[PDB]
RNA sequence: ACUCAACACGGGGAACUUUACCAGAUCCGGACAGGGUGAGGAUUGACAGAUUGAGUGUUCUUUCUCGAUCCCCUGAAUGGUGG
RNA sequence: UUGGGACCGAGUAUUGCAAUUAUUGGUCGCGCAACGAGGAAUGUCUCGUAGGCGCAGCUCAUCAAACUGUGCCGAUUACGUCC
């Protein structure tokens, strides 16, 4: 279909940020990986055609009228990207502050780093090409006879 | 069934066409006329015809380094 | 490259476009980040 | 003689379940049919009679 | 600058790229990876 | 494929020719009285074009083919054979 | 060192068509027979061509063909010889005990299969199998 | 084709054909001529040698042999067990 | 075991344009290869039926442990209930 992934832009509203605990009545309670602690709540198109659950990672937007009134879940960002994120260069995966900074809480927490992707396989698309128009030997058995 | 686009590995030589190979003013080449003797005109040819059927007409023979040959009936009296 | 502003839907709307005022394959190389511009492209698309 | 003699040849010769064709289309899938010497199931014979048959028990 | 030229470059490159694309469908960690997708979307639709 | 001026001469006095739909050769009446012998792919072509241009009107039945040919028919046929006619089917009935 | 049945090399050469077919299996007799007219044309020549030519301390040039519905005789022993599996010219040389075949056999027309580890499906308790 | 209404089922017991699939070569079955081709035209077929898996004119060399629709270029048509 | 044959080597004839990855018959050797009434579970059947046994048609150069149809030999139990 189409892309998975989106950037931030960094006008017009539109910061990264992660849940903490939710609460009810279609809010939930929102943290900034730069600033203090905020609240935010959730769009209409996603009211329960998407479920966004409790320290998954989102990207706000932010009121255009008047700053530091309430912010709101537009797009979220599905598992699979999180980890691609937060390798590249981009966010940091303790959002800081976490709670708080000042107390420091859930120290190291050593990096995981996907690397995961290559078993040692998959080496090699260099070789050969076709050889057509030769007579060439190639009998089985081989190896069968050491004698 | 299913099915993809791509045919090329290529990248030689591939076959001109055949085409045809001309001779001008065919008939003046194989008749041949002479100095007139007697106001007679003698004519004579360099194109002798097959003895077949099918050739029985007007039908001439070729000729070539090391056979002759009849394109008419594919045929060789070789040289 | 990974850095773009620009929504998915936005991109493949004009690459729909290309589609069918194709014309030197604007569409393919336009796909591969990869695009061409002179008089001798249409106004509308080149501007795309 | 040359290119002309190397095509269409060993299926006018006639062999195998290869240049069948039924009569009612032309398809030669799905059984041309020996039995008594008729063709329909290739134009099923459930779309056409018109020979005489009809289904009685 | 104009008219064959610009044509030329840009045909050119996009061969190169297809060229390099089939040259990875040569197919060893390509192939890996169809045979990821595949089973991660086999046991998806299973679990629906 | 000069066998065009036989399968025309067919054609006016009848109206009307029919062939199998084959790629091996086979005469296009099956008998014509004449005693023609034409092949299958031949005979195809010949009355594919005349279609294309109006001539004909072309039926399938099976594996088979039947031939009419027009009014219109008719005078092409005359300008190509250089002969009149007081028309095919008076003389017919 | 070699015997067919008995007849090292010049024996068997010395013998002719009829006095060949005699000594052979059944398939080859019945082959022989139910042919004539030919039905090898290019076949004999191409490799008696190439035999003739050669110097000796070394085999015969190369000859390339796809056919394998012909025998083996006497007479093309001592060739190299190509032979089709839809992909691949194959070498294959000729030698005394291959007398009594044909020329397909010697031409391999499959990789011998060897697998790789069977996935899901397979074992029909299910488990998801990782990794492969 | 996949619970019962997939799994000696697709009349499916396939040597070639059938046959979709793979490696390689061939043929127009591109109608309709608006645009080009003097008597040679544009054109068809081929022995021999060579190329080639091929005593396959496919193609070339060579020369002979033939409707001028066949031939050359765009538009369009067509066929397809392709979706 | 003379019960069963699976695998396996040699010779021969027919079918076909082509039987090599044995195509089909037909006699010798291989039998010392399995298998000694079969766990959990499970299939469809009420009289010329169940089961045993053979023949033909079908496909079609060749090959049927399949399918369709016909015949021979021919029973036990129940003819009730809703678990």
Known sequence: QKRDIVYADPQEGEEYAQVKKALGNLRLELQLADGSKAIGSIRGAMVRKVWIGQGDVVLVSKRSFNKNDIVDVIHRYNPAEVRALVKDEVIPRDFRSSDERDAKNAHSDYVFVAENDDDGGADDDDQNVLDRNKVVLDDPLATFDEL | ?79 | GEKCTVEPEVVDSLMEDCEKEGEDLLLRALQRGIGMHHAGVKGKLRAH | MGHLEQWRSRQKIGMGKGSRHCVICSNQKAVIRKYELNVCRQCFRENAANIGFSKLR | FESEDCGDLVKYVVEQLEEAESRYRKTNEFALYKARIERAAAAQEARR | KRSRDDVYRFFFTEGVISCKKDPLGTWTGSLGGKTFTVPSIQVMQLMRSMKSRGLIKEQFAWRHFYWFLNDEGVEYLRKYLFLPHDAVPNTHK | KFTYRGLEIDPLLALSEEEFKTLVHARARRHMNRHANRRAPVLLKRLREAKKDVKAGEKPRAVKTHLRDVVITPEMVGSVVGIYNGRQFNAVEIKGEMIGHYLGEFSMTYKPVIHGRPGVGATHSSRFIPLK
């Open chain 2, 1 to 79: 069934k299913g099915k993809k686009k791509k045919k090329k590995v290529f990248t030689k030589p591939k076959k001109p066409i055949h085409r045809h190979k001309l001779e001008k003013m065919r008939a003046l080449k194989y008749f041949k006329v002479t100095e007139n003797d007697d106001g007679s005109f003698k004519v004579e040819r360099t194109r002798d015809e097959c003895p077949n059927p099918v050739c029985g007409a007007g039908v001439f023979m070729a000729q070539h380094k090391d056979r002759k040959y009849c394109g008419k009936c594919h045929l060789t009296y070789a040289a």
